[PDB]
Write an enzyme that holds these catalytic residues in place. Structure first.
Site, PDB file in Angstrom:
ATOM      1  N   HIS A  95       0.937  -1.124   0.000  1.00 50.19           N
ATOM      2  CA  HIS A  95       0.000   0.000   0.000  1.00 50.19           C
ATOM      3  C   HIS A  95       0.983   1.179   0.000  1.00 50.19           C
ATOM      4  CE1 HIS A  95      -3.506  -2.408   1.190  1.00 50.19           C
ATOM      5  NE2 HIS A  95      -2.577  -3.155   1.754  1.00 50.19           N
TER       6      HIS A  95
ATOM      7  N   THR B 164      -7.483  -5.351   5.346  1.00 54.38           N
ATOM      8  CA  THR B 164      -7.692  -3.901   5.235  1.00 54.38           C
ATOM      9  C   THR B 164      -8.372  -3.468   3.937  1.00 54.38           C
ATOM     10  OG1 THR B 164      -5.598  -3.502   4.195  1.00 54.38           O
ATOM     11  CG2 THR B 164      -5.675  -3.362   6.659  1.00 54.38           C
TER      12      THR B 164
HETATM   13  N1  LIG Z   1      -4.470  -5.549   2.912  1.00 59.60           N
HETATM   14  S1  LIG Z   1      -4.722  -7.065   3.241  1.00 59.60           S
HETATM   15  O1  LIG Z   1      -3.462  -7.741   3.430  1.00 59.60           O
HETATM   16  O2  LIG Z   1      -5.667  -7.141   4.320  1.00 59.60           O
HETATM   17  N2  LIG Z   1      -5.401  -7.786   1.901  1.00 59.60           N
HETATM   18  C1  LIG Z   1      -5.052  -9.229   1.551  1.00 59.60           C
HETATM   19  C2  LIG Z   1      -6.102  -9.900   0.715  1.00 59.60           C
HETATM   20  C3  LIG Z   1      -7.332  -9.461   0.527  1.00 59.60           C
HETATM   21  S2  LIG Z   1      -8.261 -10.513  -0.520  1.00 59.60           S
HETATM   22  O3  LIG Z   1      -9.322 -11.161   0.215  1.00 59.60           O
HETATM   23  O4  LIG Z   1      -8.583  -9.849  -1.767  1.00 59.60           O
HETATM   24  C4  LIG Z   1      -6.930 -11.645  -0.743  1.00 59.60           C
HETATM   25  C5  LIG Z   1      -6.909 -12.832  -1.515  1.00 59.60           C
HETATM   26  C6  LIG Z   1      -5.699 -13.579  -1.536  1.00 59.60           C
HETATM   27  C7  LIG Z   1      -4.581 -13.140  -0.810  1.00 59.60           C
HETATM   28  C8  LIG Z   1      -4.626 -11.950  -0.047  1.00 59.60           C
HETATM   29  C9  LIG Z   1      -5.810 -11.179  -0.003  1.00 59.60           C
HETATM   30 ZN   LIG Z   2      -2.585  -5.080   2.430  1.00 62.88          ZN
END
Ligand SMILES: NS(=O)(=O)NCC1=CS(=O)(=O)c2ccccc21
Ligand SMILES: [Zn+2]
Length: 258
Positions: free
Chosen positions: A94, A196
């Site tokens: 990010h 997030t």
């Molecule tokens: N900033 S964070 O880290 O909360 N986001 C991560 C995330 C969100 S997701 O559910 O799109 C997904 C699918 C596969 C691997 C990671 C992710």
């Molecule tokens: Zn993230």
């Protein structure tokens, strides 16, 4: 009208499609260093990435993900506040439009230029999809980025960004070693939180390293050349894809260090 980071579909709008946005353990949060408490029951953190197998990199219209083969225990995180083994599935960042903003977590309200998230799922749940239905299904290792000297281990990532400029593009990205993105110290803060980005599921044990890694202005500038839009669409630079700090509510942040 999908979620994003603009004035009309950004963080303040997410709660409409994802009510949990106003939930009890949302992330990121501001880490008040003075209020965090050293926890002696934390076991040493173990980051074992020597067998990591990266597969490819993809611009998903929100950030770029470097995806790994998680079909066997090749790159895992264990120890610290975790019970069991958590397998690395992907990492992304990010970042901001300027060096004074970009991180999701903040430290005593201070914002870093960017933040790296190495996402892992609890192997006891069999797969990522199942893990995100559990309160302890995920562990995300967050690392702050500050602008200073270049980070050699990040250059391979930087150089391939030209090939995934727009939403939907992806490229082969093998033999990338994530050990090259780690700072020297593993001291960290940990607290229970969420993804997030939508769906904002509250399945995450956050482990945020105290020590930031330094990246050069030229490296972060290349992150900012990416596009949120798809090919052949009006250019919307991919910048400020971070969610601001959310209410800590009923949570205590623990430190692994005195
Ligand atoms: N900033 S964070 O880290 O909360 N986001 C991560 C995330 C969100 S997701 O559910 O799109 C997904 C699918 C596969 C691997 C990671 C992710
Ligand atoms: Zn993230």
């Amino acid at each position: 009208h999908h979620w994003g980071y603009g004035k009309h579909n950004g963080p303040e709008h997410w709660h409409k499609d994802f009510p949990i946005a106003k939930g009890e353990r949302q992330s990121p949060v501001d880490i008040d260093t003075h209020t965090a408490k050293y926890d002696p029951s934390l076991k040493p953190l173990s980051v074992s990435y020597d067998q990591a197998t990266s597969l490819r990199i993809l611009n998903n219209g929100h950030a770029f993900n470097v995806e790994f083969d998680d079909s066997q225990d090749k790159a895992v995180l264990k120890g610290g506040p975790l019970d069991g083994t958590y397998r690395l599935i992907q990492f992304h960042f990010h970042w901001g439009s300027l060096d004074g903003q970009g991180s999701e977590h903040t430290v005593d309200k201070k914002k870093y230029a960017a933040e790296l998230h190495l996402v892992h799922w609890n192997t006891k749940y069999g797969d990522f999809g199942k893990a995100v239905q559990q309160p302890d299904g995920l562990a995300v290792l967050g690392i702050f980025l500050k602008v200073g000297s270049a980070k050699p281990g990040l250059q391979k990532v930087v150089d391939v960004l030209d090939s995934i400029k727009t939403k939907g593009k992806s490229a082969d990205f093998t033999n990338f070693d994530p050990r090259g993105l780690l700072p020297e110290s593993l001291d960290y803060w940990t607290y229970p939180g969420s993804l997030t980005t939508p769906p904002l599921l509250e399945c995450v044990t956050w482990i945020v390293l105290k020590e930031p890694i330094s990246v050069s202005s030229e490296q972060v500038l290349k992150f900012r050349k990416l596009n949120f839009n798809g090919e052949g669409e009006p250019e919307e630079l991919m910048v400020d894809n971070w969610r601001p700090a959310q209410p800590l509510k009923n949570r205590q942040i623990k430190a692994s260090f005195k």
